[PDB]
């Protein structure tokens, strides 16, 4: 993440890491929304211009960790997937619209001090909390700068990191990019004059952007880290998938299988 801090132990229990089986490499982050369900950005799985097109048997998920690397011995759980669901209207080609994806674990996970769901937002928690100026929190392992060229400082960080970012208002977003923004996307991060830095960066795609609800003291996944022109550029803002505006789809696919 650019310009952020170490995470605390237990600070982000819904944080999954989408890991690649062979070879071992880290693909993105993701989030734990249930005992069996993990939510990520679609482009972490299907992105044609990059011959990144994965399927169950390629991904391996790892819940509950802090270190980017260390095995974390009776802390973190590796598991594997049963199926994958991409929003079937994902526009990878023009503007990454609708970058969402549901992934179904083969076997449900045991919650813990370190492993716990985040909540999906509801109408009235969307309305109150997604507003200009309000900060949210973004999480990830994932580069420390623009290693777009190899670069000026830290690399990829040893341990999960955090950052708090204010949401921006729509025109400012609309006007910072040539790319056509859509209603399924909000931005966030500082304004060149506001005098702070910090943003998601490559490796963070798919992770959650969360906020904390002052009405019930609960954590909420408001958005998924989706895209950006770069990392931390003055006067560019990061784009996040509006989870709430997509909620019915999330509902429909979990009310497919069960018990």
């Amino acid at each position: 993440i650019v310009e952020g801090s170490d995470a605390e132990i237990g600070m982000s229990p819904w944080q999954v890491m989408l890991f690649r089986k062979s070879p071992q490499e880290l693909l993105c982050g993701a989030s734990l929304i249930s005992d069996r369900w993990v939510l990520t950005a679609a482009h972490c799985l299907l992105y044609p211009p990059w011959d990144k097109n994965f399927t169950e048997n390629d991904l391996l998920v790892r819940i509950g960790k802090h270190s980017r690397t260390r095995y974390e011995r009776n802390i973190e759980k590796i598991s594997m997937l049963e199926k994958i669901y991409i929003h079937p209207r994902y526009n990878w080609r023009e503007n990454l619209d609708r970058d969402i994806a549901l992934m179904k674990l083969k076997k449900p996970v045991a919650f813990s001090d370190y492993i716990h769901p985040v909540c999906l937002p509801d109408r009235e928690t969307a309305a109150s909390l997604l507003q200009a100026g309000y900060k949210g929190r973004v999480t990830g392992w994932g580069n420390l700068k623009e290693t777009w060229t190899a670069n000026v400082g830290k690399g990829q960080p040893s341990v999960l990191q955090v950052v708090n970012l204010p949401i921006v208002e729509r025109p400012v977003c609309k006007d910072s990019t040539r790319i056509r923004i859509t209603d399924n996307m909000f931005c966030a991060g500082y304004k060149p004059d506001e005098g702070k830095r910090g943003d998601a960066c490559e490796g963070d795609s798919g992770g959650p952007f969360v906020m904390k609800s002052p009405f019930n003291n609960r954590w909420y996944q408001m958005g998924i880290v989706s895209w950006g022109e770069g990392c931390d550029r003055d006067g560019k803002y990061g784009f996040y998938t509006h989870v709430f505006r997509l909620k019915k789809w999330i509902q429909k696919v979990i009310d497919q299988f069960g018990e």
């Binding site: 600070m11 449900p108 716990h116 204010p166 904390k212 609960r218 069960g258």
Partner: protein, 36 residues
Amino acid sequence: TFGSGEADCGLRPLFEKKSLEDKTERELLESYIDGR
């Protein structure tokens, strides 16, 4: 269908439950109408 921690979700075992407030949480909430 469930099987879904929509239930005791968003509650971190190690903070809220344990009645604790992480290092920077305060900021989040402090921005909710500039006001905490």
